[PDB]
Amino acid sequence: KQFAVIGLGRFGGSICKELHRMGHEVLAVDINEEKVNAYASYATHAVIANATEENELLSLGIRNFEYVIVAIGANIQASTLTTLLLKELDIPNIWVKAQNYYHHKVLEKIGADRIIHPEKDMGVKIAQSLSDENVLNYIDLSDEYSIVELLATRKLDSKSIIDLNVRAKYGCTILAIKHHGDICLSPAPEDIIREQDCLVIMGHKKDIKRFENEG
Amino acid sequence: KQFAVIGLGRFGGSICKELHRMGHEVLAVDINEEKVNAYASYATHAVIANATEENELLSLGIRNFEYVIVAIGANIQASTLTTLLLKELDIPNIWVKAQNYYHHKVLEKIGADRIIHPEKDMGVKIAQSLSDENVLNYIDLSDEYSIVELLATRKLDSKSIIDLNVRAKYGCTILAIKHHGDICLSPAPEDIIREQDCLVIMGHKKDIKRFENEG
Amino acid sequence: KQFAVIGLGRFGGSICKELHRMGHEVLAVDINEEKVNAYASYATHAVIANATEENELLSLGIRNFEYVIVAIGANIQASTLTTLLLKELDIPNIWVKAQNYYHHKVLEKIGADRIIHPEKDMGVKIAQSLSDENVLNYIDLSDEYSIVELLATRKLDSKSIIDLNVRAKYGCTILAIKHHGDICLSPAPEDIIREQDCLVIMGHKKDIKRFENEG
Amino acid sequence: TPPQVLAIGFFLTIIIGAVLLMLPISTTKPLSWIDALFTAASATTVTGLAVVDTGTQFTVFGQTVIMGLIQIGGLGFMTFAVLIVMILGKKIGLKERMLVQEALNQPTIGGVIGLVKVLFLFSISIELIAALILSIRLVPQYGWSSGLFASLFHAISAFNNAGFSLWPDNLMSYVGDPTVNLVITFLFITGGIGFTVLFDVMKNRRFKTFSLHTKLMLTGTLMLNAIAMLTVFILEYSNPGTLGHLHIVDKLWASYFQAVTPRTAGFNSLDFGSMREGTIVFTLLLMFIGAGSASTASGIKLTTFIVILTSVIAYLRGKKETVIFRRSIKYPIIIKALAVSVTSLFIVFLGIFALTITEQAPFLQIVFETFSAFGTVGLTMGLTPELTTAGKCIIIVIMFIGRIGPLTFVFSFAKTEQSNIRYPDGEVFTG
Amino acid sequence: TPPQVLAIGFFLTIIIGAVLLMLPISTTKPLSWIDALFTAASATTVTGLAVVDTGTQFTVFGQTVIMGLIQIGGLGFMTFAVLIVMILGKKIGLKERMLVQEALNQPTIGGVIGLVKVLFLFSISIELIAALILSIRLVPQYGWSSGLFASLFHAISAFNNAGFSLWPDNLMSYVGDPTVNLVITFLFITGGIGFTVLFDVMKNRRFKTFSLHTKLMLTGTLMLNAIAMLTVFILEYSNPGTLGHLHIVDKLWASYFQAVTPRTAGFNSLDFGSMREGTIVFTLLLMFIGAGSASTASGIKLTTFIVILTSVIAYLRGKKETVIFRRSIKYPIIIKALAVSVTSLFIVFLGIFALTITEQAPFLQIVFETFSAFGTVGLTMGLTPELTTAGKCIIIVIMFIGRIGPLTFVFSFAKTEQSNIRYPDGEVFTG
Numbered sequence A, B, C: 001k002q003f004a005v006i007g008l009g010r011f012g013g014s015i016c017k018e019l020h021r022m023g024h025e026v027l028a029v030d031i032n033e034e035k036v037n038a039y040a041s042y043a044t045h046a047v048i049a050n051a052t053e054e055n056e057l058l059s060l061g062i063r064n065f066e067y068v069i070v071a072i073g074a075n076i077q078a079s080t081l082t083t084l085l086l087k088e089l090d091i092p093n094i095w096v097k098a099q100n101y102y103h104h105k106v107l108e109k110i111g112a113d114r115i116i117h118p119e120k121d122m123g124v125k126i127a128q129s130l131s132d133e134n135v136l137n138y139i140d141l142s143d144e145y146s147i148v149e150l151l152a153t154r155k156l157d158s159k160s161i162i163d164l165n166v167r168a169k170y171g172c173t174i175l176a177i178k179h180h181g182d183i184c185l186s187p188a189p190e191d192i193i194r195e196q197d198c199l200v201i202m203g204h205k206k207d208i209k210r211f212e213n214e215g
Numbered sequence D, E: 001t002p003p004q005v006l007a008i009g010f011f012l013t014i015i016i017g018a019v020l021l022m023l024p025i026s027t028t029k030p031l032s033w034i035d036a037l038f039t040a041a042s043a044t045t046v047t048g049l050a051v052v053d054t055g056t057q058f059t060v061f062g063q064t065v066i067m068g069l070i071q072i073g074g075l076g077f078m079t080f081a082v083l084i085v086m087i088l089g090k091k092i093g094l095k096e097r098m099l100v101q102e103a104l105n106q107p108t109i110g111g112v113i114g115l116v117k118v119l120f121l122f123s124i125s126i127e128l129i130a131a132l133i134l135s136i137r138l139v140p141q142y143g144w145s146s147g148l149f150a151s152l153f154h155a156i157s158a159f160n161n162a163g164f165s166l167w168p169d170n171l172m173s174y175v176g177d178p179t180v181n182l183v184i185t186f187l188f189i190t191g192g193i194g195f196t197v198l199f200d201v202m203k204n205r206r207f208k209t210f211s212l213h214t215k216l217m218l219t220g221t222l223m224l225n226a227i228a229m230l231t232v233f234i235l236e237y238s239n240p241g242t243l244g245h246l247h248i249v250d251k252l253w254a255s256y257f258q259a260v261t262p263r264t265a266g267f268n269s270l271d272f273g274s275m276r277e278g279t280i281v282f283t284l285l286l287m288f289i290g291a292g293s294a295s296t297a298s299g300i301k302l303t304t305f306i307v308i309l310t311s312v313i314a315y316l317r318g319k320k321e322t323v324i325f326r327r328s329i330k331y332p333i334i335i336k337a338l339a340v341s342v343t344s345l346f347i348v349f350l351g352i353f354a355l356t357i358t359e360q361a362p363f364l365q366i367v368f369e370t371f372s373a374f375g376t377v378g379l380t381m382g383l384t385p386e387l388t389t390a391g392k393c394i395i396i397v398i399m400f401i402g403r404i405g406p407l408t409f410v411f412s413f414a415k416t417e418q419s420n421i422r423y424p425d426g427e428v429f430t431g
């Protein structure tokens, strides 16, 4: 797999550094000279180029990349023109970072395979942690079911798993308990719940909220 | 014929590409480096130069060109100083793209052989198509007579030329009828008028409008 | 005589071109690259330098010039700092172009040998020609006496010098009469005054105005 | 493509000239196919290297073909191409004007057609006058039939920086003659100073009005000939083979002649094979440098040598820019001079490397022959008649690239691809 | 002044070494003042040119002084200066750190004191190991008293790129020996690759993490030795004097050894005086290029040659910048490489010009001696014993400038005056 990342910002530069860490061939393209010099050591190849130009895009050998990530999310004109060129060049996978709702609609029309909202998705996840401080990290399996990594309270100290009627009353299944950097995978009844550490739970979205308030 | 086009914009770059397509020697002059690099392949010779400078203008051999087109229509100072230099250099034909009414008056004073308003002429032609959707393209022979390429309506379907009394009542002559990419030059009575395709007509400006409303 | 002109503007560039025409060694100094390239052929030596810097000023050999003209009249900080350096370097003659009344007072304090107001002096001379269209060019010998090059009117046609009682009544002396590109130096009585051509007169400032109104 | 027209057109004149010299009419003796090709190439490249003697091998018609190749090659292929089009009445287009810009090494197409009119009219005028001046000397010695032709041949040969001579001794019988020395040295000095330099002196009669290039050529040539005249006179004063059995007046003429002839005429008054090794070393640097960008000379030009030398001295003195005659020199001028000098040394190195493999000759003669062939000088130490069939083919390639220039030869087969992309800076220690 | 300290300090080691070699204790035979000065200069400049045989003229104490001058000269004057200050306990100041930056040709003073600790510890470690490996061969042939000293002398000589040998035949008796060939070639290849290159390989074990300079030296040396090995083997295969009366295994060893020894060790296994002229021409280039900016070699460096060559090819291909290994090269890097190459050729040209006036020798031997002396290689064709008193003084100047570098020698006596003024652009035709 050969990856090309166009636009070395906070979001684009993180993809370059992570893919280079995993041992992947990454082409880092940016119009800024200082950005390319900073990410020259964090990419297989770093080029100072304008992606809105077809002649400069063909000089990179961009047709040899299966995945191209257009991480420009503040210039709609630069973002939409780039993916119009890549779609014309028959790139199998174009992932674009969008800015707002209207930018999302343009990229969907001109054939962007996946459209990403990094700050919008994180802001929704952060606002869930602000509203309820008991949660630490959650993953939405669907619109009604989710896996929530809860934080243990003071009332849950010295409590066994069989004491908590999550399976019967709340209809939720405890998945894993982490104690002081040691994680217990699929605990069996019964285990004593320690102080304020991680507690992974799975259930309906409304059912987990009932467990937090009651227990 | 040797042509020089000064200013590679939307209007100037179109003259360079069209004259180069027809097989003409075109000199493309622009002050922008990126514009010259883009039109280097679409011109016989492309130079990065400032046309307001006499020394740079004489380095191009501009005295060897019969036609010079000054396609700068947003910088009045650059446009008027260029044609003042070319008039001083005794260029036989200087065609200048103007911006407004006052720019047109300056270029007429300093000796511009032909003054062009590309957006103003197109806006008048477009507004004729907006006002009456039956017309497609027209050419003004004079202030009272024009050739209008009409669009066939539903009431004109299955109608013969002799049925339409354009020659007698409206005083208009049908010139050519185009059917599905096939154009009939000077049709003879009588031909069946098909569905919504081109229909070229010639007559007085007020007489064609009567034909559209009545038929 | 070696002259240095600092600041190649409309006023400074005219001194460089005129002194170079007369056959003088002129050093043209300007902070603008384009100004120096334009006046490289009109000066013996043209240097791109900042005159407010003592190190750059000493690199020019500015101590070898008897006359230095600081023709900067829109930047008071650049103008006053330059002449402070030249006064410290013991330049015998520093001529500075001023901007307003307050700039004139600063340069007088820091030791400018001659202070020049080019636009202010021309505006006063132009306004004299606007107020009275009979005058063409005048030179103020003093605050009450001047030499005025008048323009002949229609009433002065076919008139002899002895007919005009300028010597007796007006107390003014006719100096020279120019007829169609031919100038008569110190005409003798009597000469016929032709149509609207030059007529040099000398007298009191109030006495010439009486001659214009009466004759 | 403008460099491709120059390479194709200049190579075709070698083939056309080789056929004409190989005809039985043009020669008195049978001539080899390689020797006919070498003589034709040595004429259109205007070098002067002769395997066979020009006077004996060729007839009067054969020497007339030599004069045609010298005149065509000396002024350039595209110089006469414009004249033919102008005579026929066809107007010069923009495409035809770009060829003249490339042939004359001009930066702009501004007033380049009018330069060809000036340089062609000046060439025929000064060769006709110099033939008349040489006629007062060559006619009482060789009659009217041969005296007039010898003056006409040598005026064209000297002005175009050829070095061809009809006599078996290349100007070795006129060491002390001021008539032959002054006229011939006036020809290749003015003919090699540059067509742009000559046009500037004609229109401007004051030195302060000259351009930077004109002031460099006038001052650079005067200083370079002064150093060369002192070097040859001092080194060869006690030499018994050359400059030893001569009067003090004759020593000054031969020292002056040998100071100016390596750039790039290739005439001689003393035998280069009997000179000391010290003078030959100085002559190789001398004939590695030519004269004039648009002239009849070759090699790296005098302005290329001055630009590189001043750029280094400015760096060694800590200066941030190259300044000659109180004028800054931009980066594109420096890199073009860098490309000319490096490519020329690479081709000369390959020529010396290829000749040592093939030819069994002393090393000093091999180096002297390669610098003379590449600079199109034509001075020999006694190697050109001794070259093998493979050795002559190497010199023909060297003379061809030397006359057309290393840059225009490479641009013929090097396609240019434009890329606006850039790369991050890398640090490499080049101490 | 940092270039002035290097020039003064490096010259004082010649004077100190000349006195020590001139003492009756250090020599078995009377020695001339010029020969003592030449031997001392050939050791601190680490060239290896010997008028007199090292084994016979000098005693064991005299050869110990040679090892001291080779070690001091090979690693640099300021390398041991920092060690003395560190041992005494005095801290290294900013002024003392700027001298190390100039001596090591570094662009920044970031981590330059720690580099000296690495390169000195690596030098003594690898010379001690290589002496032990050479001890298994030199001891059964020369006993314990001389076998241990011969291995210690040659390990220091080979690592520092000296070429000094105790035996009358400089490694000509070990043509087919894999023990002497592999160990010695491993020393000057690694000792000449660069101290910065070695430090990068030690701390980074993956090629993609190397810097641009390290990747240039590793790939450039491998490609240059491959071309040189093919050139020597093909050209000298049929030569009766060298590489003719040898087995196929022995031909591969001698071709490999002579491919790597001109940069810049100067050892040999075949006689260079009996080689063909074609191989000598290719070695002249070969030993005009050194290896490593901060190493024990001299001449123009391998990175200087690559930077200039790539800059020209980029110009010929129409590219607007010099790109090697997908990294752009800035203008200051190009102009520094331009100044090194032009100044080096000017000094070599003056050396050849001065030697031809003084020495009565074949021209090929004079050119070979000057390139060998300037690059501090030490290969001879049979001229160094035949040099006159004036000829030896020219070589000492050439060896001195070659080791210290042309740039640092000029910066000693060229005062730098800073001027911020600029000049209008001038157009000069450099075609």
Ligand SMILES: Nc1ncnc2c1ncn2[C@@H]1O[C@H](COP(=O)(O)OP(=O)(O)OP(=O)(O)O)[C@@H](O)[C@H]1O
Residues within 6 Å of the ligand: A006, A007, A008, A009, A010, A011, A012, A029, A030, A031, A032, A035, A049, A050, A051, A052, A071, A072, A073, A074, A075, A078
């Ligand atoms: N046409 C272009 N071609 C290539 N790179 C570009 C182009 N236009 C902008 N960039 C670069 O893309 C990068 C990211 O774009 P930008 O900063 O506008 O978006 P952003 O949404 O604010 O970024 P982020 O949130 O990832 O920091 C910048 O480094 C910018 O220089």
Ligand SMILES: Nc1ncnc2c1ncn2[C@@H]1O[C@H](COP(=O)(O)OP(=O)(O)OP(=O)(O)O)[C@@H](O)[C@H]1O
Residues within 6 Å of the ligand: B006, B007, B008, B009, B010, B011, B012, B029, B030, B031, B032, B035, B049, B050, B051, B052, B071, B072, B073, B074, B075, B078
């Ligand atoms: N002095 C000049 N000399 C040459 N070219 C110039 C000069 N000034 C402007 N140009 C170029 O002329 C071109 C057209 O001018 P400009 O964009 O100002 O006019 P416009 O009326 O907006 O153009 P258009 O409608 O054709 O797009 C531009 O590419 C601009 O860079």
Ligand SMILES: Nc1ncnc2c1ncn2[C@@H]1O[C@H](COP(=O)(O)OP(=O)(O)OP(=O)(O)O)[C@@H](O)[C@H]1O
Residues within 6 Å of the ligand: C006, C007, C008, C009, C010, C011, C012, C029, C030, C031, C032, C035, C049, C050, C051, C052, C071, C072, C073, C074, C075, C078
């Ligand atoms: N510090 C400086 N050193 C040298 N030249 C300078 C400096 N500052 C300004 N100049 C140059 O001086 C010239 C004249 O100055 P400026 O244009 O500010 O004055 P001005 O009164 O408007 O000029 P003018 O009426 O003569 O046109 C300009 O070309 C400007 O670039």
Ligand SMILES: [K+]
Residues within 6 Å of the ligand: D046, D047, D048, D161, D162, D163, D264, D265, D266, D376, D377, D378
């Ligand atoms: K010649």
Ligand SMILES: [K+]
Residues within 6 Å of the ligand: E046, E047, E048, E161, E162, E163, E264, E265, E266, E376, E377, E378
């Ligand atoms: K050595």
Ligand code: NA
Residues within 6 Å of the ligand: A010, A119
């Ligand atoms: Na952001």
Ligand code: NA
Residues within 6 Å of the ligand: C010, C119
């Ligand atoms: Na003003």
